[PDB]
Design an enzyme around this catalytic site. Structure first.
Site, short mmCIF file in Angstrom:
data_model
loop_
_atom_site.label_atom_id
_atom_site.label_comp_id
_atom_site.label_asym_id
_atom_site.label_seq_id
_atom_site.Cartn_x
_atom_site.Cartn_y
_atom_site.Cartn_z
N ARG D 372 8.23 -2.71 -2.31
CA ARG D 372 8.34 -4.12 -2.31
C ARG D 372 9.35 -5.04 -2.68
O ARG D 372 9.32 -6.11 -3.07
CB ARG D 372 6.89 -4.51 -2.92
CG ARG D 372 5.99 -4.87 -1.95
CD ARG D 372 5.21 -3.85 -1.17
NE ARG D 372 3.96 -4.60 -0.49
CZ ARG D 372 2.98 -3.77 0.30
NH1 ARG D 372 3.37 -2.12 0.44
NH2 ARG D 372 2.24 -4.09 0.87
N1 ADP Z 1 9.53 -7.12 8.83
C1 ADP Z 1 9.91 -6.08 8.02
N2 ADP Z 1 11.16 -5.71 7.74
C2 ADP Z 1 11.52 -4.63 6.64
N3 ADP Z 1 10.53 -4.31 5.89
C3 ADP Z 1 9.22 -4.65 6.12
C4 ADP Z 1 9.10 -5.47 7.16
N4 ADP Z 1 7.50 -5.69 7.03
C5 ADP Z 1 6.98 -4.64 6.06
N5 ADP Z 1 8.07 -4.27 5.39
C6 ADP Z 1 7.97 -3.19 4.69
O1 ADP Z 1 6.51 -2.71 4.43
C7 ADP Z 1 5.93 -2.92 3.15
C8 ADP Z 1 4.63 -3.48 3.26
O2 ADP Z 1 3.57 -2.38 3.52
P1 ADP Z 1 1.96 -2.74 3.71
O3 ADP Z 1 1.93 -2.52 5.16
O4 ADP Z 1 1.87 -3.98 3.17
O5 ADP Z 1 1.19 -1.82 2.65
P2 ADP Z 1 -0.50 -1.91 2.28
O6 ADP Z 1 -1.04 -2.54 3.71
O7 ADP Z 1 -0.70 -0.78 1.62
O8 ADP Z 1 -0.50 -3.42 1.46
C9 ADP Z 1 6.86 -3.68 2.17
O9 ADP Z 1 7.18 -2.78 1.20
C10 ADP Z 1 8.16 -3.80 2.93
O10 ADP Z 1 9.31 -3.20 2.50
MG MG Z 2 -2.36 -4.30 2.00
#
Ligand code: ADP
Ligand code: MG
Ligand code: ADP
Ligand code: MG
Lengths: 51, 472, 187, 506
Positions: D372
């Protein structure tokens, strides 16, 4: 030398432990019961009275 | 005479209380215990008998002794409601998480209320121009309906939620409520800071969003009931205020997870794959309490964390049937490079009608789905049989599908630091026209990488020109 | 509310009987009836085996009840009802336990709290009397109740006492004290 | 000696005072024992999660409070305790010593000194179970954590306060990367600026005593023991020790965090903690929830890892960076415990066994290892060079899979494929070799900017050493400028470009 002295302290500590347990075993044989029984009976009486 | 009880058993998040009178508190009643560190609230779950009931702890059972005095409120858990909650962080028990003083709400509605009746169901097919290519193309979002964001771990579910908030809530106009159900506190802090910066949250003035946080650090009862609290906020905003509520429920699967949590220690026999037996019913009332009525509308935007990316898991599978718009964030596309990861096939919405989005939009969506399905079917053919060992028409369809999949990628403003490209937005008409032009083969000669991380067709041609200039 | 909390099916009947006797204010009659029944059980070792039998049928359990009831011509107006309730619930193999918790309830309310002054050696009776008066005069669960401390000669104690009274024991035994210095000596 | 005598006299005077004060305030009679869980009568008004003293000497704590019987999990061997043993309660919630004296000391789950170096001097005692900080006390992760791995751990950083997961199979490098991070923190904790020091704390739960002895030996070999706490529960002690050791490590971490300091905690192999909780719950009469695991495993991971956070300036701006480690079987990241911990953390670091067997010692898969703090909570020099390099590497992997699928304009003819393969070969590291952030930007910059087209995959390993020697011998100007500034500006970018295309010919 400092770790050798630390080992010396550790072995002195364990020798003290052996001496303590040997003296405990010695106390398990000598007549050392009635006086301490009276002593901590008075101690528990004073504990009850203090509250 | 207030109802007084004594705690008999404390099993983790489950507390047993006995009342020395015939006046037994009803189910879902709020039972408050005066702890040295504050106040602990217990919600009655079952009437075990012998004048003893089973409760769910709203807070961690820290220092809970047997025989501690318990006081019954008389009704369910009540949280502050109204315009006062806007711009304020709301806990599961209603106490202000933020340190900006108390909440001077006129009313305190209970979190357990009957769902709206069948008569008061004002269904509608209004479109929602979110600004993301794939969702605006294949599974158009419905204004006032229920919204799904299914995806696994590390697939962009929270990123997609933040992007949707940024895109819509700023131009939404009406009130909204963000509800964090069992999600990381750090993500909630980032979202709070981002909406403070963007002007959605105005501490010294008027705020268009009310924040309810039941974060994943909190005990299982808090995680289970924060969805109910935020739902009550949304219901009051929809009915009393008569405004379009943009409910953003985050990680709604945590509600079912906490239901299974409490169910194991409640004596319930575990259901399939260990879930709670009452998952369907309780999530049914929770979700059906979200609906478009005559008084107003609640546009619930839910993200579902699918365990192990297994769509056959009972909770996401039933959430699929209990939801209008579905947006599956498959990991197989997330790691493929298109991190938007919206799988173009299982992401379906009820708005996919010729009389709703238009005949041209429907035809474009059907054709792009056809191309992507041909790609998926010929995946193995390309893999080990050989891409060159294919017919001309099949090869052209595969190339078009690959170009479309690359085009599905869209930079996000909230993910600008993540993707490294500014998060431009695309209008629904622009996406429809660009995809119709692409399906016609007008951009076949353009390399697939030009569609990578771009917005409209203007971005596509600009990227193609820049790559031609830099490569020569 | 019953004087003390009882748990399990072996004890639920005891507290139910105590609650029933509280309504009629005949706790003493039920207590005496229970002592008479357990004395009759001790009188006939075979009868004790009859009670503990789980395969013994409903008519046979009822016959055992009429046997233990016809003597003394009635134990009590309610304890016979408890016995027949046990018969229809198949709980004659626990009557000794039910009598045990009913007795515990009896000393819970009648001011007959019990204590266990456990020691390595049998307690000297002159020292026995000193223990009784001090704890009786103390405020340890003291609201106008008598005391029934009894010496418990056990080998686990190296020496001294563990004055036990109402969920309160004093760590005054010399065995625990000499050990408590050992771990700190091994630091 | 002199000190044992006076210590013993004072403590036994306190013992007599305790025995003579308020009786003992509650007791109990043991009803059952086994596998480190003990049933006990009495304890009518015992507090929840409360420490209890046993007559034999074993410690205990109250997970379950049934009517009449109390569920006590045994803190140590259950051999000593028998039936009828008196169970005194300590009168307080389960605590652990916390303070600056734990630095350089190894302690158990209960906080007692086990390294034999003497008593533990703690400022206070913190509860093992502490509620995580709220939204407002938490702060956005912006301060970088220098992992010192010269790998994807740099291009996609950790930062101060992130719970960055380390997934992978056993013997893949999870403990290796943890110890490299701990060693690299020495360069910043050896100074005087407390705002940049990272007082590490290790959690060697479910680790054999020989392995943890070798680990502490390696730590003090590199002078890393001065700032690292090795609070842990080995495989020798009982399951409750394993269950509580990470929580008391979390308590120490919050003490460092609540005091304005920055602490790095590595929950090494939480799997044994989860199965220790399983062992508690099986004989504590808590029915299992899913897959023979009690449901509360997700909750316990939640409370334990969400305590790790970056505090705001109001709360002291402290950081509690967490490095959880899970041992998966066969690379099954879709198993239960994986799914919960990947959903409990802020990103993960995948360490597959095949990459370790291939030859890449870090053995980290770029494709699935997310975080993140992409181009955030970094130095800034690395965040500008490789703010989105992970997506490019993932696309390189996909196209390389696509390239092998069919013979087309791919393979070496693809600039993206060449850049991706060169960068993947670049991202490698040897253990016990902490590399500073200054000697990491030029390599990644050469990789990202397409300066490695004509260097060949086999020669990239030598190119790394040659380029680093070039900077550290005759181009230290821009290297030290990057190190001191913590960012590459237009001048620094131009100087780095000068160095890279001057050294591209070699
Ligand atoms: N448009 C994007 N470009 C690059 N990386 C992304 C993008 N969208 C999401 N990510 C990556 O995906 C991760 C988000 O994971 P997520 O699906 O939210 O996990 P959870 O559902 O367990 O919260 C982030 O750490 C980010 O680095
Ligand atoms: Mg989530
Ligand atoms: N350059 C290297 N990087 C990482 N590990 C290495 C390297 N060279 C050898 N190793 C071996 O890899 C092992 C790492 O195992 P480790 O990750 O500690 O196991 P676990 O994952 O069970 O904790 C070490 O025992 C070490 O001997
Ligand atoms: Mg290891």
């Amino acid at each position: 030398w400092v770790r050798y002295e630390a080992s010396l302290r550790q072995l002195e500590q364990r020798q003290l432990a052996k001496s303590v347990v040997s003296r405990v075993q010695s106390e398990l044989g000598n007549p050392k019961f009635q006086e301490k029984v009276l002593q901590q009976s008075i101690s528990e009486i004073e504990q009850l009275l203090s509250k | 005479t207030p109802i007084t009880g004594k705690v008999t058993a404390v099993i983790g998040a489950i507390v047993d209380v006995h009342f020395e009178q015939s006046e037994l508190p009803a189910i879902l009643n709020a039972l408050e215990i005066k702890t040295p560190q504050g106040k602990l609230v217990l919600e009655v779950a079952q009437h075990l008998g012998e004048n003893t009931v089973r409760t769910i702890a709203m807070d961690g059972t820290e220092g809970l002794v047997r025989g501690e005095k318990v006081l019954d409120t008389g009704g369910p858990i009540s949280v502050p409601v109204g315009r006062e909650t806007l711009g304020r962080i709301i806990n599961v028990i209603g106490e202000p998480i933020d340190e900006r003083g108390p909440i001077k709400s006129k009313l305190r509605k209970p979190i357990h209320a009957d769902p709206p009746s069948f008569a008061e169901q004002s269904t509608s097919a209004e479109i929602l121009e979110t600004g993301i290519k794939v969702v605006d193309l294949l599974a158009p979002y419905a204004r006032g309906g229920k919204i799904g964001l299914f995806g696994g771990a590390g697939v962009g579910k929270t990123v997609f939620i933040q992007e949707l908030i940024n895109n819509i809530a700023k131009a939404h106009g009406g009130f909204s409520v963000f509800t964090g159900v069992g999600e990381r506190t750090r993500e909630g802090n980032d979202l709070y800071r981002e909406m403070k910066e963007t002007g959605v949250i105005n501490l010294e003035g008027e705020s268009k969003v009310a924040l309810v946080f039941g974060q994943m650090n909190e005990p299982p009862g808090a995680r289970a009931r924060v969805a109910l609290t935020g739902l009550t906020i949304a219901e009051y905003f929809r009915d009393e205020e008569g405004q379009d509520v943009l409910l953003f429920i985050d990680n709604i699967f945590r509600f079912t997870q906490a239901g299974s949590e409490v169910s194991a220690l409640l004596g319930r026999i575990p259901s399939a794959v260990g879930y709670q037996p009452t998952l369907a019913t309780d999530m049914g009332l929770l979700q059906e309490r979200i609906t478009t009525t005559k008084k107003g509308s609640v546009t619930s935007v839910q993200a579902v964390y699918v365990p192990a990316d297994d769509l056959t898991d009972p909770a996401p599978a039933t959430t699929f049937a209990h939801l209008d718009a579905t947006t599956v964030l498959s990991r197989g596309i997330s790691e493929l490079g298109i991190y938007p990861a919206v799988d173009p096939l299982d992401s379906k919405s009820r708005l996919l009608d010729a009389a709703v989005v238009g005949q041209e939009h429907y035809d474009v969506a059907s054709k792009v789905q056809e191309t992507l399905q041909t790609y998926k079917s010929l995946q193995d053919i390309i893999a080990i049989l050989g891409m060159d060992e294919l017919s001309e028409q099949d090869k052209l369809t595969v190339e078009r599908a690959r170009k479309i999949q690359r085009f599905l990628s869209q930079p996000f403003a909230v993910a600008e630091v993540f993707t490294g490209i500014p998060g431009k937005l695309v209008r629904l008409k622009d996406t429809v026209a660009s995809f119709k032009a692409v399906l016609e083969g007008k951009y076949d000669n353009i390399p697939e990488h030009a569609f990578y991380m771009v917005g409209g067709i203007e971005d596509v041609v600009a990227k193609a020109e820049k790559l031609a200039a830099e490569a020569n | 509310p019953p004087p003390v909390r009882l748990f399990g099916v072996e004890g639920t009947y005891a507290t139910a009987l105590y609650q029933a006797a509280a309504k009629n204010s005949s706790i003493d009659a039920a207590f005496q009836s229970l002592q008479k029944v357990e004395s009759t059980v001790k009188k006939n070792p075979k009868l004790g085996h009859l009670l503990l039998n789980p395969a013994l049928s409903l008519k046979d359990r009822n016959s055992v009840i009429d046997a233990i009831v016809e003597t003394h011509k009635n134990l009590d107006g309610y304890v016979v009802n408890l016995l027949k309730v046990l018969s229809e619930n198949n709980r004659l193999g626990c009557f000794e336990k039910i009598a045990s918790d009913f007795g515990v309830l009896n000393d819970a309310h009648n001011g007959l709290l019990k204590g266990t002054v456990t020691s390595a050696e049998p307690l000297d009776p002159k020292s026995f009397k000193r223990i009784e008066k001090a704890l009786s005069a103390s405020k340890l669960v003291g609201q106008g109740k008598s005391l029934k401390l009894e010496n418990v000669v056990k080998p686990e104690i190296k020496g001294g006492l563990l004055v036990e009274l109402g969920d309160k024991t004093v760590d005054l035994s010399i065995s625990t004290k000499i050990q408590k210095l050992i771990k700190v000596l091994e630091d | 000696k002199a000190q044992p005598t006076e210590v013993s006299s004072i403590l036994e005077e306190r013992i007599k005072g305790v025995s003579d004060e308020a009786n003992l305030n509650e007791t109990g009679r043991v009803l059952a024992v086994g596998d480190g869980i003990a049933r006990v009568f009495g304890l009518n008004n015992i507090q929840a999660e409360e420490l209890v003293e046993f007559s034999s000497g074993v410690k205990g704590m109250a997970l379950n409070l049934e009517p009449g019987q109390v569920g006590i999990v045994l803190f140590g061997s259950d051999r000593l305790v028998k039936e009828g043993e008196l169970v005194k309660r300590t009168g307080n919630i389960v605590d652990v010593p916390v303070g600056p004296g734990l630095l350089g000391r190894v302690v158990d789950a209960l906080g007692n000194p086990i390294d034999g170096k003497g008593p533990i001097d703690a400022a206070g005692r913190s509860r093992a179970q502490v509620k995580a900080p709220g939204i407002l006390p938490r702060r956005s992760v912006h301060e970088p954590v220098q992992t010192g791995l010269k790998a994807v751990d740099a291009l996609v950083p950790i930062g101060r306060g992130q719970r960055e997961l380390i997934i992978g199979d056993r013997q893949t490098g999870k403990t290796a990367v943890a110890l490299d991070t701990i060693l690299n923190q020495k360069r910043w904790n050896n100074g005087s600026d407390e705002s940049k020091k990272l007082y590490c704390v290790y959690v060697a739960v479910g680790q054999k005593r020989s392995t943890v002895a070798q680990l502490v030996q390696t730590l003090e070999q590199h002078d890393a023991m001065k700032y690292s706490i090795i609070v842990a529960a080995t495989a020798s002690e009982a399951a409750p020790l394993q269950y509580l050791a990470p929580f008391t490590a979390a308590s120490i971490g919050e003490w460092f965090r609540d005091n304005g300091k920055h602490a790095l905690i590595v929950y090494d192999d939480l799997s044994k903690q989860a199965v220790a909780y399983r062992q508690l719950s099986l004989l504590l009469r808590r029915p299992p929830g899913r897959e023979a695991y009690p449901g509360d495993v997700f909750y316990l991971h939640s409370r334990l890892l969400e305590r790790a956070a970056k505090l705001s300036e109001k709360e002291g701006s402290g950081s509690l960076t967490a490095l959880p480690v899970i041992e998966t079987q066969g690379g099954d990241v879709s198993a239960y415990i994986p799914t919960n911990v990947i959903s409990i953390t802020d990103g993960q670091i995948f360490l597959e066994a095949e990459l370790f067997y291939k030859g890449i010692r870090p053995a980290i898969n770029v494709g699935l290892s997310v975080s993140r703090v992409g181009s955030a909570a970094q130095v800034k020099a690395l965040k500008q060079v490789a703010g989105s390099l992970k997506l490019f590497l993932a696309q390189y992997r996909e196209v390389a899979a696509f390239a092998q699928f069919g013979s087309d304009l791919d393979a070496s003819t693809k600039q993206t494929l060449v850049r991706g393969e060169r960068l993947t070969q670049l991202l490698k590291q040897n253990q016990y070799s902490p590399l500073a952030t200054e000697e990491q930007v030029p390599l990644i910059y050469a990789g990202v900017n397409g300066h490695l087209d004509g260097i060949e995959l086999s020669r990239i390993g030598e190119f790394e050493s040659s380029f680093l020697s070039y900077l550290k011998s005759n181009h230290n100007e821009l290297l030290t400028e990057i190190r001191e500034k913590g960012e590459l500006s237009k001048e620094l970018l131009a100087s780095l470009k000068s160095a890279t295309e001057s050294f591209v010919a070699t």
